[PDB]
């Protein structure tokens, strides 16, 4: 509506979950990413293979 690109940085939910959540509301996150108007970054860290 206002022509501003968006970025969604998720630390818990995966992109599939993020898209499916709003799929029912009528938005098409698949299309908006397929066009890159919203970019999804799933920034997940696993402590199992992490030694500090």
């Amino acid at each position: 509506d206002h022509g501003e690109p968006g970025v969604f940085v998720t630390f818990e939910e995966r992109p599939e979950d993020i898209v499916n959540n709003v799929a029912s509301l009528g938005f098409e996150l698949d299309k908006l990413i397929e066009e890159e108007k919203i970019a999804i970054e799933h920034i997940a860290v696993d402590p199992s293979e992490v030694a500090e």
Binding site: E41, I43, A44, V45, E49, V50, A51, E52
Partner: protein, 85 residues
């Protein structure tokens, strides 16, 4: 026997990380594995491809289960124990 070291820029952390990697690899043990250093700034994409978050990182892929070590590798003994087999 392959090791990858992800760093970003001529940062004191990354420089100390590579220097300490040199020290532990050479003085502590022989050349059992080969090291490759990647500076993330030029390729931010590779950061996403390898799923890297915190600099500096030392990742081994020789064994089937991956293992990462986060930091500048200040503790020689701990780094060697984490990389020993």
């Amino acid at each position: 026997r392959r090791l990858v070291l992800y760093v970003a820029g001529q940062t004191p952390k990354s420089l100390a990380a590579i220097s300490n990697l040199r020290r532990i690899c050479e003085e502590n043990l022989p050349g059992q594995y080969e090291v490759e250093v990647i500076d993330l700034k030029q390729n931010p994409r590779l950061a996403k491809e390898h799923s890297i978050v915190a600099i500096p990182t030392l990742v081994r892929e020789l064994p089937v289960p991956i293992r990462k070590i986060i930091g500048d590798l200040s503790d020689k003994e701990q780094v060697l124990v984490n990389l020993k087999m």
